[PDB]
Amino acid sequence: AEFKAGSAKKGATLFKTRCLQCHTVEKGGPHKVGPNLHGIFGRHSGQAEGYSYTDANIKKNVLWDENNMSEYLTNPKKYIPGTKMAFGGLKKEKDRNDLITYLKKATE
Ligand code: HEC
């Protein structure tokens, strides 16, 4: 199914274990391997200030919402062929819902 609100509490733990190694969520957080995700929802892909993306990520030009984020996070490389995000995906729909619920709030 499409996105449905889950548990931000569980999503934060998922973020810590699966994402935090490469990403920050806070405005002005440290620079990492992946782009700062502050403000990601409602922004097009490839637009974080001062980050060097693949051409693939820029050219996809997806306007990130909670539904296409769930599709992307299922399998990043299938959604954006050639992306340099070294992440196979979140297989479980419940995990995607929980993570995205946390991410939507934490990146405000
Ligand atoms: C490093 C080992 C990473 C892990 C673990 C995760 N991400 Fe990532 N992400 C990473 C890179 C290097 C990039 C840039 C990709 C490119 O081709 O240029 C990304 C990109 C994203 C994006 C897109 C951001 C945009 O502005 O378009 C998102 C939304 C994203 N990453 C989210 C994300 C989440 C939620 C993770 C855990 C589940 C995660 N990433 C892991 C590097 C790495």
Swiss-Prot record:
The cofactor required is:
heme c
Task of the protein? Electron carrier protein. The oxidized form of the cytochrome c heme group can accept an electron from the heme group of the cytochrome c1 subunit of ubiquinol-cytochrome c oxidoreductase. Cytochrome c then transfers this electron to the dinuclear copper A center (CU(A)) of the COX2 subunit of cytochrome oxidase, the final protein carrier in the mitochondrial electron-transport chain. Isoform 1 (CYC1) is the predominant cytochrome c during aerobic/normoxic growth.
- Organism, by scientific name, is Saccharomyces cerevisiae (strain ATCC 204508 / S288c) (Baker's yeast)
| Example of a GO MF term | heme binding
Q: Where in the cell is it found?
A: Mitochondrion intermembrane space
- The answer to whether the entry has keyword Electron transport is yes
Q: How is the cofactor bound?
A: Binds 1 heme c group covalently per subunit.
Tell me which UniProt keywords the record has, alphabetically. Answer: Electron transport, Heme, Iron, Metal-binding, Methylation, Mitochondrion, Respiratory chain, Transport
Q: Name one GO cellular component term.
A: mitochondrial intermembrane space
Q: What does the entry report about post-translational modification of this chain?
A: Methylation may enhance its transport into mitochondria. Methylation occurs in fungi, plants, and some protozoa, but not in animals. The precise role of methylation at Lys-78 is unknown, but it seems to preclude pro-apoptotic activity, possibly by lowering affinity for APAF1.
Q: What else is known?
A: Present with 7330 molecules/cell in log phase SD medium.
Query: What PANTHER family does the record point to?
Result: CYTOCHROME C
- What is this protein called in UniProt? Cytochrome c isoform 1
- Name of the gene encoding the protein in the UniProt record: CYC1
**Ligand binding (heme c):** 19, 22-23, 85
Identify the InterPro entries for this entry. Answer: Cyt_c-like_dom, Cyt_c-like_dom_sf, Cyt_c_1A/1B
- Please cite one Gene Ontology biological process associated with this protein: mitochondrial electron transport, cytochrome c to oxygen
Coiled-coil regions, chain positions: none
